[PDB]
Structure 1
Amino acid sequence: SQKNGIATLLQAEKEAHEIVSKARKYRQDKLKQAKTDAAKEIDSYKIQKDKELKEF
């Protein structure tokens, strides 16, 4: 039963590693995302201030 008990628990670990690997992926996505959603706030704030200069 050597090759059934070791084989099954090890496969469990191969699944366990894959879930951890998805959450690492998730975290990389959130870094790229962060630069992206900060870019959309600057250039809308930029033109708001440019609005009130043009009003002036």
Structure 2
Amino acid sequence: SQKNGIATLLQAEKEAHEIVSKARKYRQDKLKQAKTDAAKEIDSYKIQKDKELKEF
């Protein structure tokens, strides 16, 4: 298993990087999510303000 295993350890190094990179890219998605769901919270707060304006 000496000359099979080395190839296996080689593969784990590429997979190791890849797990990390996939989490580093997941993070980046989270940042966009913050800007998207916030863009939605402002125009739902607009109509909140328009609701108590048409009541006054």
Moved over 2 A (4+): 1-8
Following superposition, the deviation at residue 8 of structure 1 comes to: 2.7
TM-score (norm 1): 0.81
Cα distance between partner residues in 2 of 1:43 and 1:17: 40
Aligned residues: 56
1:25 aligned counterpart, secondary structure: helix
Cα distance between partner residues in 2 of 1:17 and 1:26: 14
Cα distance between partner residues in 2 of 1:37 and 1:18: 28
Unpaired segments of 5 or more residues in structure 2? none
For residues 1-38 of structure 1, what are the alpha-carbon distances to aligned partners after superposition, in whole Å with 9 as ceiling and x for unaligned? 88655433221100101111110110010000100011
Cα distance between partner residues in 1 of 2:49 and 2:31: 28
TM-score (norm 2): 0.81
Aligned-residue CA RMSD (Å):
1.8
